Structure formats: C-alpha cells, structure tokens
Amino acid sequence: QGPPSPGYYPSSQITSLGFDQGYTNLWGPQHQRVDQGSLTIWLDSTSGSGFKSINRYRSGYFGANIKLQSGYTAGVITSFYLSNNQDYPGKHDEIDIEFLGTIPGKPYTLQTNVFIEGSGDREMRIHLWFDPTQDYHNYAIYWTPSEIIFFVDDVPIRRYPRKSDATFPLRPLWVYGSVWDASSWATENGKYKADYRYQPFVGKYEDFKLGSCTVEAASSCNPASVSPYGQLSQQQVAAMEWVQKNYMVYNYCDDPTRDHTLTPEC
Ligand SMILES: [Zn+2]
C-alpha cells in the first residue's frame, strides 16, 4: 500500500532535461557517459567520477531520476547535492542527498544533510519503501530563502525551515553529483569498506529537473512551486510523517550523543 500519496507531484510539473542542458563533467571524464540525455558514471580502483551544474543558483527545485547498483556496494556513495565548497574552501555550505552503499542482503541508506559555514552534523537517514537498484526514482532538493525540503518521488522526507541565519544556507550553490569511495564512514560508519573485486560501481541519472533561479536571474524569478497552496499540504505532511515514523533510522536532533546546543534549529 506504499506511503500515503503526497497528493501533488512537483517533479511532474517541471521540464525533464538531458545532462548536457544543465551539467558538465567535473572530474573522471573517462568514467562518464551520456546517452540521449541520460548519465552513467562509475567508480573503479583508478577513479570515480563527478559532475557539476553549468549555472550557480540562489534558489530552486533541483531534481534527478537516479538508479543505484545492486550487490556489494559497501564504502561507495552515490550523491546528488548542492554545494559551494569550491567557492568557500574549508568553510562552505551544502545540502546533500547521499546514497550509502551496502553489503549483499542489506538495504541502501539515504542520508540527507545540511552544512552552514563548515558546520554539518545535521544528518537524517532513512531506508526506502522500494528497491532503489531495480528502477529509477525521483529525488530532489528544494531550497528557498525560507526552507529546504527533501523529496523522494515527490514524497517529502524532510523539511528544514529557516529558523536563524546562522543555521541556514544563504549563499549561492552549485549542483553536483559523484560516485566515490567513502570507505571510512559510508557503510555502518565504516564497519564495511569498498571491495573492488565487485568493480565497477555504477550510478545512473536522468530526467534532470531545474525549477530554479540562477544568481544572474532577474529579481522577478521564482523557484518552482512545491505545493499549489504555497505551503506543504495536509497530504504532503501526512506522507512525510509516515516516512519519519516508519523509515527514519537516524535523526541528529534525537541522538543523545550529540550536543543539540551546537545545532540550535533542532
Ligand atoms: Zn547542550
């Protein structure tokens, strides 16, 4: 019976783009292929690969349909995220979706995170109500000057509203993705690490969505809307609460080992 329907589908209301309309390779070009707008990138023992948006943004809906690799994927991260780390090295902002690979038999973990001026430790993790290796699913980051919302097939899984300037991303961000070896922490905090006998490790992305406002855009520009009612509807919130009740496996604000004073938005 799945999650309760969100009752509105932002992803379907925004034009699907091919990779080359929004993005170019950043690194590992030899581990990147594009076929009719669809992106394939992969990790082996010599290199991963990653890409970067052509434009730099001040707000928007940023979406892609992604398919993950099954089998042994421990230590491997497939990412889709906003960042300004190349603009503010060592003290940057970030809004992350990271798929954390796994040993055979166990599910992927989807981690969301927010970094402001170097300060992260704002992770929430869920498992999914479908197999993310079998088919492509929609995943999206919505970012405006009042909120961040993270979506899976238009189901909101997390909302991060602007509570104070110190705890919210207020500088321009680029979109990135990558497949890379994060063995030290990706899978059960590094309990299980990359094994290249199972290489390559492939990430697949298509139907890119950019309902967004570049830094250069006219001040009339509005990001794509995520509800016909201005705010999350009753159905959207119920779908989100169902996800958090039934699929959330980690929330920073509820971890007794974390000092929530350091993350005052909790
Ligand atoms: Zn405290």
Residues 6+ apart with CB under 8 A from 140: 10, 11, 61, 62, 63, 64, 150, 151, 154, 209
- Which residue ranges are tagged as binding site for Zn(2+)? 259, 261
Tallying the residues shown for the chain, one arrives at 266
| Domains: count for the chain | 1
**Would you say 150 and 158 are in contact if contact means Cβ atoms under 8 Å apart?**
yes
Q: By C-alpha distance, which of 96, 64, 92 is closest to 82? A: 96
Residues 6+ apart with CB under 8 A from 64: 80, 138, 139, 140, 177, 205, 206, 207, 208, 209
- In angstroms, the CA 198 to CA 264 distance is 42
Resolution in A: 2.1
**Residue 108 dihedral angles phi and psi, to the nearest 5°:** -65, 150
Burial of 46 from C-beta contacts in 10 A (0-12 / 13-18 / 19+): exposed
Tokens of 25: 């390779």
Distance from Cα 146 to the centre of ligand 1, integer Å? 26
- In angstroms, the CA 14 to CA 35 distance is 21
Active site residue 94: yes
**Would you say 66 and 195 are in contact if contact means Cβ atoms under 8 Å apart?**
no
- In angstroms, the CA 190 to CA 59 distance is 34
* SS3 per-residue string spanning the chain: CCCCCCCCCHHHHCCCECHHHHEEEEECHHHEEEECCEEEEEECCCCCEEEEECCCEEEEEEEEEEECCCCCCCCEEEEEEEECCCCCCCCCCEEEEEEECCCCCCCCEEEEEEEECCECCCCEEECCCCCCCCCCEEEEEEECCCEEEEEECCEEEEEEECCCHHHCCCCCEEEEEEEEECCCCCCHHHCCCCCHHHCCEEEEEEEEEEEEEECCCCCCCCCCCCCCCCCCCHHHHHHHHHHHHHCEEEEHHHCCCCCHHHCCCC
Instruction: Using the structure block, give the residue that is written with the tokens 């207020």.
Output: 170
**Would you say 175 and 52 are in contact if contact means Cβ atoms under 8 Å apart?**
yes
Question: What are the strands of the beta sheet with 94-100, ordered from one edge?
Answer: 23-27, 49-53, 174-181, 76-83, 94-100, 109-115, 124-126, 248-251
Distance from Cα 187 to the centre of ligand 1, integer Å? 28
Distance from Cα 242 to the centre of ligand 1, integer Å? 29
Identify the active-site residue in 94, 206, 241, 265.
94
CATH number at residue 186: 2.60.120.200
List 206's β-bridge partners, or say none. 65
Residue range(s) defining the domain that contains residue 158: 1-266
- In angstroms, the CA 225 to CA 14 distance is 10
- In angstroms, the CA 106 to CA 186 distance is 14
Question: What are the strands of the beta sheet with 137-143, ordered from one edge?
Answer: 32-35, 38-43, 201-214, 57-67, 137-143, 147-152, 155-161
Q: Which residues crowd ion ligand 1, with CB under 5 Å?
A: 259, 261
- Sign of the alpha-carbon dihedral angle for 195, 206, 100, 2: negative
Q: By C-alpha distance, which of 134, 138, 142 is closest to 169? A: 142
**Would you say 141 and 82 are in contact if contact means Cβ atoms under 8 Å apart?**
yes
